[PDB]
Amino acid sequence: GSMAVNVYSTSVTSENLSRHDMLAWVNDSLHLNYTKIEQLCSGAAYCQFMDMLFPGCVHLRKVKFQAKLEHEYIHNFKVLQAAFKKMGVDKIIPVEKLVKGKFQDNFEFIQWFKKFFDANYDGKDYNPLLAR
User: Fold this and answer.
1) Which of 105, 116, 122, 124 has its CA nearest to residue 14?
2) What is the CATH number of the domain that holds 70?
3) Number of independent structural domains in the chain
4) Where in the sequence is the domain holding 122, given as residue range(s)?
5) Residue 48: CB partners within 8 Å, gap ≥ 6?
6) CB 115 within 8 A of CB 108
7) Measuring CA to CA, how many Å separate 100 from each of 16, 24, 69, 91, 114?
8) How far is 90 from 58, CA to CA, in rounded Å?
9) What does the DSSP assignment read for 42-96?
10) 70-87 and 44-53 helices, crossing angle to 10°
């Protein structure tokens, strides 16, 4: 399969999305019910999005889908980091900041990730039940 297309500060991208529109995209894409951007700090949605982009790049059997504690969030980001390495994604994930559930760091990361997704997504169907 093809390697990831990286997104840089110099890459041409769409404009940033509002909190509402970003969550609408997450919810539609993954069949989720997120209401706060900070829910992305668990790492699980990122792992699923990587599977949707490049099926097989991520070890979804390791993903904690009902994570509630920092150590579980770090667990999921380890899974995400492995997927990034496998796909040649060169973006540094600020894991320590994200897992604290801080708004600013989580909002910046999802803005980048949406641009990354748009640069890479081929329109394939994604069954969110299969990983669960």
Assistant:
1) 116
2) 1.10.418.10
3) 1
4) 1-132
5) 30, 60, 63, 126, 128, 131
6) no
7) 23, 23, 10, 19, 21
8) 16
9) GSHHHHHHHHHHSTTSS-GGG--TT--SHHHHHHHHHHHHHHHHHHT--PPP-HH
10) 20
User: How big is the chain, counted in residues?
Assistant: 132
Token pair, residue 71, equals 């150590």
- Identify the experimental approach: X-ray
One-letter amino acid for residue 28 of the chain? D
Q: Which amino acid is at 29?
A: S
Resolution in A: 1.4
Task: Work out the burial of residue 59: count CB atoms within 10 Å of its CB; fewer than 13 is exposed, 13-18 middle, 19 or more buried.
Answer: middle
For 1-25, letters b (16+ CB in 10 Å) and e give eeebeebeeeeebeeeeeeeebbee
CA–CA distance from 67 to each of 70, 72, 103 (Å)?
8, 6, 18
N- to C-terminal Cα distance for the chain? 24
**Tokens, residue 87:** 């796909």
